[PDB]
């Protein structure tokens, strides 16, 4: 209404939209005010209007710690109060509906620290401080920076709209505009909460990113089983209880692991609750800065943050605080930790603090790879995540994919137009023993320049037409004369030996050749089922694909055969398994030269044919 | 207009399909194809109702066809024949809506899946799988094989409204799939998000597209290094290459000059990635012959294809219906050339008129496969659809499930109970705490107070009348206990010397306990590794206790006991391995290196109770 639509139209000089899970969103406007200290936050005398109401919104910078005597850096960053003169409530459905979208890009998006220098400072802290007894865990930050096109609050609004749609689950999602600065974020964590004397801190313990299909009751339980990461958790709770004990004299009470569910990720949470009577101003001052964004112990964390960060923190790890009164006049506080948040200028310069929480068991690269990762929430709001090539197109991913093709055949990756010896012009018969690999052998013999016809085992052919015959692969046991297909292969092979026709036999056919020449066939203890093996093929090492269940087996590297003559045997000498024969008019192979698993198959077939055909 | 989609949305299309296809060109506005026409059941692939070829000048779609697994008789291969028919839906109407607008418009529906179970259970399936791995693969029958079981369930008051609802959820969750669809016939509805295409044909050019591997992104995120590690892994080139070889075989029979492989390429999803290869070649065959001769990708049958079919018939007890079959979109380009886009029917529900759901899941088996691993994997595979029927955000809950409540409540088992709780000689009795500047003191105080002690706190350098108190507690604080140079530490020495000299009962803790050690002459050292909030089980004077340590320094001694001038026999509790001292017990006093108060200590209040009690004598 008049506030929201005067906010959006630009006639509100100073404002905030804050959206909370208590679905409505809160809109505020008033005087921007820069108090001298927390003591001087502009708070009226307590009164009861009869309605709940908000008195001011406050941004507490990390500097403010001087108030407690703790060492800091001066960012020039002041204490900021926005009186809530006006406060209206929207419905998020219609509010999102209005959106003045703009080029919400970010020029020169670079880090303060950068991965080489940041890893050094982090290492120094893990080894010189944590490892030295300075403290149990610590939060160390760098700033990502970038420059905004055209600029103005109209841009902060757009980023707020996108944050509202996707990061559904954060504690506060907001845009806050002073005159001299803007803030946009979606913070997951509350700082402190005060309702009728009762104070609440609320640290987040863990995060369960749901897998591809959906969040199961078993995936969540698996995640919750694994209790092998009890580290920071308990130092943080102790440190939180310490903080509560200074604020609530009677103590704190933890209520623990509660599950916080969101569209994509589930958090684990603890609440810590206690009774206090202290002024809000004292509550903030003494509660300056949740252990989860500083360290434990707090003072020492402060000391190490000062003795290892080159910069100030501006408002990173600080507090956005909504101070008010219930309808009965009792004091109220709702407050959120300022992380996952951009601080912007009129000048147009955006800064986002990102921290890493360091324990002794944490190593620097692993967490630096979380510097960019945790930044995904905001990063996907200065230029959304789908406009740009997928990670499948990063040159490294491309390289790794390509490396996969290194061991294997390169013929099949080549386009037709991967054609090119004395073989060019010659003609070959392939006798098909009923294996679909034959078309593949044929395509390869073709590429060497052979015109390559295929018949079946029972066909009548004129051998005189062909320069070579190839006896092919097929199913079955080569010792099984009972199968007429196998019997006919014996006949073929006896004939080709008799006539001295050059030939090449392969898998089954090669086994049958062995049996004919009198080398025994056996069956492997374990069948080969598409393995590449490096073998010694007659003096040259070759990597070839095996699919055989059966194999010829001999102790002999060579033999004279009665009718035939001298046959060279290539075999694994450890097992006697025969890989290839070379005879006077022929050559043979147990392996599939044509498999995707073979290297230089076309050449292997080439060499075999060439040898079979040499005898002229 | 959207006339058709509106018709679908309001229950006014007796036969329709929505199919959301990858094949558009990554344009930056995903489109859903919507179809309506006559359903017919041709008696064979030959007899699919296809016009004589013509060119209308626009690309155009003619038939949508569902080929059941049974259809393998057409190639002479054995199947369990359940008689699922061949379904042809003429594409009389074909419009195109935007997925963004489409999804907004589909209403949600309660699509709970009742009496949900696997037709063959986990124990029976593990047997079948073992038999296949051992008797078939191990024996030479073939390199890999796909064996299937079926998830079954019931939808109350079924109608297309519900299928649309499941389709919508699937569109939200499963972007990356090759086809996401709902196909509705009067007699059956199909809903799925299949990852794999079967075959496509564009200008004479045939493509198959097997998926090789899967990379589940680890919580939290996917990285250029995790992906590259996974790609580098290659420690099981198993079915990958048998599958390619088999795919090249298949292509050779329809593309006479052979296929060419391209890839692998990365196929990305919201939380997972697949590796995929393309295989392409030129064909001239009729689409009817292309389907018949490409009946059933190796990736859902096995290799070699025909023995896979034989093995499947042997070991699956039933038919497959449409599981591992093909949904085919047959059409013509603008010039009249033939077109085919088609998807393998896995990850898909077949719903009947009465609302009975069936979902086939397979396991790919190689020689090194493990039956049990693969049974459990089938539960994983079906989660996508299972959740598209029964979302977690729907079922009021997601963590209020008593199993989740239990696992949450397990975490608090090891740790302190006092701090999770709201607000005896030791009874009424009075204690001073000297605060060495540690925020733990408020906590120690709250614990002493709960034992009934009225507990005042002063600082070092304050002046006090000891007579007012029953015990003095010398508290924790920062610093090196060997460092006299710090005035705070010096004053703690003076306190402790005084309390020993006067014999005032006292209890010293962390820093103060270290200073007590130094006074009594036991040496202090600095640990090789500082304790930084660890719970340790120690032997505290005969009783085992679990306590929280935060110390950087520690006393260390080989002695279990010692006599000292000022007061007599001090008992030392220490780790008998290392000599690190945990506690002292003297005549006038007691002390502890650990934080009885920490959230990391088990029965803290009792432990300090026992210490105070002992100090007083």
């Amino acid at each position: 209404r008049n506030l929201f639509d005067r906010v959006l139209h630009g006639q509100a000089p100073c404002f905030a939209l804050i959206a909370r899970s208590t679905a409505m969103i809160d809109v505020f406007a008033g005087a921007v005010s820069y108090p001298s200290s927390l003591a001087e936050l502009p708070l009226a005398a307590p009164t009861a209007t009869g309605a709940d109401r908000q008195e001011l919104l406050v941004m507490v910078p990390y500097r403010q710690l001087h108030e407690r005597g703790f060492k800091t850096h001066d960012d020039g960053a002041p204490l900021v109060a926005i009186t809530c003169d006006e406060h209206e409530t929207v419905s998020a459905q219609l509010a999102l509906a209005a959106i003045p979208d703009a080029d919400t890009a970010l020029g020169e998006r670079h880090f303060d620290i950068d991965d080489e220098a940041y890893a050094e400072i982090v290492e120094r802290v893990i080894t010189d401080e944590i490892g030295t007894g300075a403290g149990s865990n610590f939060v160390i930050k760098r700033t990502l920076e970038g420059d905004l096109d055209d600029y103005s609050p109209a841009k902060a609004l757009a980023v707020f709209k996108r944050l509202m749609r996707r990061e559904v689950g954060a504690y506060w999602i907001f845009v806050i505009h002073t005159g001299e600065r803007t803030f946009v974020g979606a913070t997951p964590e509350r700082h402190l909460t005060l309702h009728e004397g009762c104070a609440t801190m609320n640290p987040i313990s863990g995060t369960y990113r749901y897998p591809q299909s959906g969040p199961t009751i078993d995936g969540i339980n698996a995640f919750l089983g694994d209790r092998k990461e009890s580290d920071e958790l308990y130092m943080v709770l102790d440190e939180e209880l310490k903080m509560m004990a200074r604020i609530c004299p009677a103590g704190g009470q933890v209520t623990g692991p509660h599950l916080r569910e969101m569209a994509r990720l589930a958090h684990t949470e603890y609440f810590i609750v206690g009774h206090t009577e202290a002024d809000v101003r004292d509550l903030l001052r003494e509660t300056m800065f949740a252990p989860t964004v500083t360290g434990s112990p707090i003072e020492s964390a402060t000391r190490v943050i000062a003795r290892h960060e080159r910069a100030g923190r501006g408002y990173y790890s600080g507090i956005a605080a909504l101070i008010g009164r219930d309808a009965r006049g009792g004091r109220t506080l709702d407050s959120a930790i300022l992380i996952r948040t951009a601080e912007i200028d009129r000048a147009g310069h955006v800064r986002i603090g990102v921290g890493s929480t360091l324990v002794r068991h944490s190593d620097a690269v692993s967490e630096v790879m979380e510097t960019h990762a945790k930044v995904a929430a905001l990063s996907n709001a200065f230029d959304p995540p789908e406009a740009g090539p997928a990670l499948g197109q990063h040159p490294s991913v491309q390289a790794a994919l390509r490396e996969r093709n290194e061991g294997i055949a390169d013929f099949w990756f080549r386009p037709y137009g991967g054609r090119q010896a004395e073989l060019s012009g010659c003609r070959a018969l392939i006798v098909d023993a009923e294996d679909h690999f034959t078309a593949m052998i044929a395509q390869q013999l073709s590429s060497l320049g052979l015109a390559t016809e295929v018949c079946g085992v029972h066909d009548a052919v004129d051998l005189a037409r062909y320069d070579v015959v190839v006896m092919g692969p097929g199913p079955g046991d080569p010792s099984d004369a009972g199968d007429p297909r196998i019997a006919r292969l014996y006949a073929w092979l006896r004939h080709l030996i008799d006539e001295g026709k050059p030939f090449m036999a392969v898998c089954l056919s090669h086994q049958i050749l062995n049996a004919i020449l009198g080398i025994p066939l056996v069956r492997r203890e374990v069948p080969n089922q598409g393995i590449q093996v490096e073998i010694d093929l007659f003096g040259q090492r070759e990597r070839v694909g095996f699919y055989n269940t059966y194999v010829a087996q001999t102790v002999r590297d060579e033999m004279d055969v009665d009718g035939v003559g001298t046959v060279a045997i290539s075999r694994d000498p450890r097992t006697g398994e025969v890989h290839a024969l070379r005879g006077p008019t022929f050559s043979s192979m147990q392996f599939h030269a044509e498999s995707v698993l073979t290297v230089d198959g076309p050449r292997i077939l080439g060499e075999a044919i060439t040898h079979a055909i040499r005898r002229e």
Side-chain angles (χ1 to χ4, degrees), chain A residues 2 8-10 12-23 25-31 33-70 72 74-92 95-98 100-102 105 107 110-112 114-115 117 119 121-122 125-141 143-146 152-160 163-164 166 168-179 181-212 214-226 230-264 266-306 309 311-339 341-342 344-345 347-349 351-355 357-360 363-364 366 368 371-373 375-378 381 384-385 387-418 421 423-524 526-616:
Chain A
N2 61 41
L8 253 87
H9 295 334
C14 187
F15 63 86
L17 303 149
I18 308 173
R20 310 186 266 132
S21 279
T22 327
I25 133 188
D26 285 293
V27 15
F28 298 93
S33 138
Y34 294 49
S36 54
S37 73
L38 289 156
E40 263 92 55
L41 285 154
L43 297 160
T47 55
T49 308
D52 279 25
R53 101 192 157 274
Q54 231 58 43
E55 281 191 284
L56 63 172
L57 174 46
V58 189
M59 307 286 131
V60 185
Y62 177 80
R63 188 173 123 205
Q64 268 292 119
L65 280 164
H66 80 267
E67 280 239 66
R68 289 187 78 174
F70 299 173
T72 191
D74 240 291
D75 341 321
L79 179 63
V80 196
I82 297 161
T83 86
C84 296
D85 280 301
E86 282 160 326
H87 172 225
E88 190 197 282
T89 170
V90 205
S91 179
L96 295 135
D101 202 38
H110 69 292
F111 275 106
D112 202 346
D114 127 290
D115 301 56
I121 280 283
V122 174
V125 174
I126 303 179
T127 79
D128 298 352
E129 305 280 20
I130 288 177
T132 278
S136 60
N137 42 353
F138 292 134
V139 188
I140 293 190
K141 79 110 214 320
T143 326
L144 76 135
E145 295 191 293
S152 91
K155 312 287 175 127
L157 287 172
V159 184
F160 169 77
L163 273 174
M164 282 276 292
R166 282 282 175 258
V168 237
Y171 183 76
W172 277 17
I173 309 192
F174 59 94
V175 50
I176 300 160
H177 182 57
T178 74
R181 250 160 297 244
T182 315
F183 297 92
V184 202
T187 178
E189 204 173 326
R190 104 185 48 173
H191 179 77
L192 187 65
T193 251
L194 192 54
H195 187 193
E196 305 208 317
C198 168
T200 305
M201 298 185 71
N202 181 177
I204 288 170
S205 138
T207 296
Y208 176 60
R209 195 141 210 79
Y210 309 154
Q212 167 45 35
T216 62
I217 293 285
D218 316 57
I220 289 172
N221 263 264
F223 165 84
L224 287 179
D226 212 60
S230 62
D231 51 41
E232 57 134 316
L233 178 51
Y234 295 115
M235 304 115 75
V236 167
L237 271 74
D238 270 346
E239 195 64 41
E240 227 108 348
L241 280 174
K242 274 136 102 161
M243 189 153 118
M244 227 72 258
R246 284 174 93 269
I247 247 184
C248 305
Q253 190 214 108
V254 183
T255 111
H258 289 289
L259 212 157
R260 160 130 58 111
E261 311 198 33
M262 309 167 21
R264 274 150 313 193
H267 291 296
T268 271
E269 283 188 307
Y270 290 85
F271 305 92
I272 307 178
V273 294
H275 185 81
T276 180
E277 288 176 341
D279 199 54
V280 277
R281 285 173 304 241
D282 304 330
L283 284 170
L284 297 167
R285 172 159 41 240
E286 298 301 324
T287 218
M288 282 206 289
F289 299 145
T292 59
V293 281
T294 45
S296 143
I298 274 291
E299 258 250 36
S300 180
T302 272
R303 259 175 274 152
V304 316
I305 291 147
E309 293 190 305
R313 294 192 156 190
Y315 300 65
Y316 171 79
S317 78
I319 299 153
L322 201 38
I323 300 163
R325 291 211 176 274
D326 79 33
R328 261 192 60 258
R331 160 70 76 220
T332 258
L333 173 61
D334 186 12
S335 163
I337 304 188
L338 283 169
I339 61 171
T341 300
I344 290 175
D345 281 342
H349 203 248
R351 285 204 228 123
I352 298 173
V354 288
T357 46
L358 312 198
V359 315
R360 208 183 37 256
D363 107 275
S366 292
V368 179
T371 190
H372 308 323
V375 177
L378 268 158
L391 75 55
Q393 234 100 65
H394 187 53
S396 352
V397 178
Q398 297 236 93
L401 287 146
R402 258 196 254 108
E403 197 71 297
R404 310 215 55 234
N405 296 333
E406 201 35 69
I408 65 163
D410 82 58
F411 179 91
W412 297 111
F413 286 81
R414 219 128 55 179
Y416 192 106
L423 271 15
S424 193
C426 290
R427 197 150 271 175
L429 185 58
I430 301 181
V431 188
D432 177 32
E434 308 195 358
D435 203 316
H436 285 356
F437 270 119
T438 311
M440 297 174 61
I441 299 165
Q443 281 148 18
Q444 278 187 5
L445 294 178
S446 273
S447 72
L448 294 177
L450 285 316
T452 304
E453 279 147 41
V454 183
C455 62
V457 129
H458 298 282
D459 293 321
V461 195
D462 197 327
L463 290 198
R465 188 207 220 66
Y466 304 95
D467 303 279
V468 234
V469 174
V470 182
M471 300 305 292
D477 169 3
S479 292
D480 181 32
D483 181 349
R485 196 174 102 268
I486 284 141
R488 203 15 173 140
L489 286 174
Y490 273 84
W492 266 97
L493 279 153
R494 288 205 213 270
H495 185 66
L496 292 178
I497 294 165
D498 260 72
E499 292 320 80
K501 185 80 199 176
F503 72 86
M504 186 176 93
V506 153
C507 207
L508 186 58
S509 291
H510 153 101
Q511 301 174 328
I512 299 188
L513 179 60
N514 278 262
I516 284 164
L517 277 22
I519 296 173
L521 311 172
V522 313
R523 154 184 214 120
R524 298 172 49 93
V526 177
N528 284 150
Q529 308 198 99
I531 337 223
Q532 189 180 83
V533 179
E534 205 165 272
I535 63 165
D536 183 300
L537 204 57
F538 309 108
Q540 221 207 333
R541 287 236 131 203
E542 301 296 344
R543 257 128 69 248
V544 309
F546 282 95
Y547 284 87
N548 56 327
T549 268
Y550 296 97
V551 73
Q553 213 208 17
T554 178
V555 320
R556 305 200 66 195
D557 290 323
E558 165 144 309
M559 65 187 312
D560 284 346
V561 164
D562 193 48
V564 195
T566 312
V567 183
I569 302 151
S570 157
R571 54 198 272 273
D572 180 356
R574 299 172 291 176
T575 65
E577 296 186 8
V578 172
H579 296 138
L581 302 173
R582 257 172 187 181
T585 69
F586 64 78
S587 64
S588 67
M589 334 172 316
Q590 173 69 83
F591 52 86
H592 288 256
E594 72 284 15
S595 178
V596 94
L597 277 175
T598 289
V599 171
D600 301 351
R603 179 171 61 70
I604 293 162
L605 296 159
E607 289 169 353
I609 289 157
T610 292
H611 172 86
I613 276 182
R614 208 162 303 192
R615 191 152 172 173
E616 68 232 12

